[PDB]
Amino acid sequence: DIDESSVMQLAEMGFPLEACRKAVYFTGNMGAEVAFNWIIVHMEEPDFAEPLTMPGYGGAASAGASVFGASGLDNQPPEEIVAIITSMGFQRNQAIQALRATNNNLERALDWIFSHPEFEEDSDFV
């Protein structure tokens, strides 16, 4: 009779078109297509149907927010410091290794690195 199937069809793909509800009753049972038409002609109306209630039509809405990248990009020591360390004369990767142990502590990295001459010397003699 007043087949609310028609209004729900509009609703479940767009907005709560209670305007369709009364439209189906108003149209005189002309089918969903006809009440769909009643709505698309009255779409101009702002508040003919609650425009702040999405019953089912997202896709573009529900996606995400890729602002953090892949979350924690790589686990390499501070390139600033690894740079400084290899600028001290050490190896960048060696600086990385050191900072790995020192927990990105620059000075301690050099500390860690310094105790590794090359083949462990004895030419200190202090």
DSSP states of 26-93 as a string?
A: HHTS--HHHHHHHHHHSTT-SSSS-TT--SS--SSSSS----STTSS------HHHHHHHHHHTS-HH
Task: For the domain covering 74-126, report its CATH number.
Answer: 1.10.8.10
Residue ranges per structural domain of the chain = 1-42, 74-126
| Topology match between the domains 1-42 and 74-126 | yes
Query: Which fold, 1-42?
Result: Helicase, Ruva Protein; domain 3 (1.10.8)
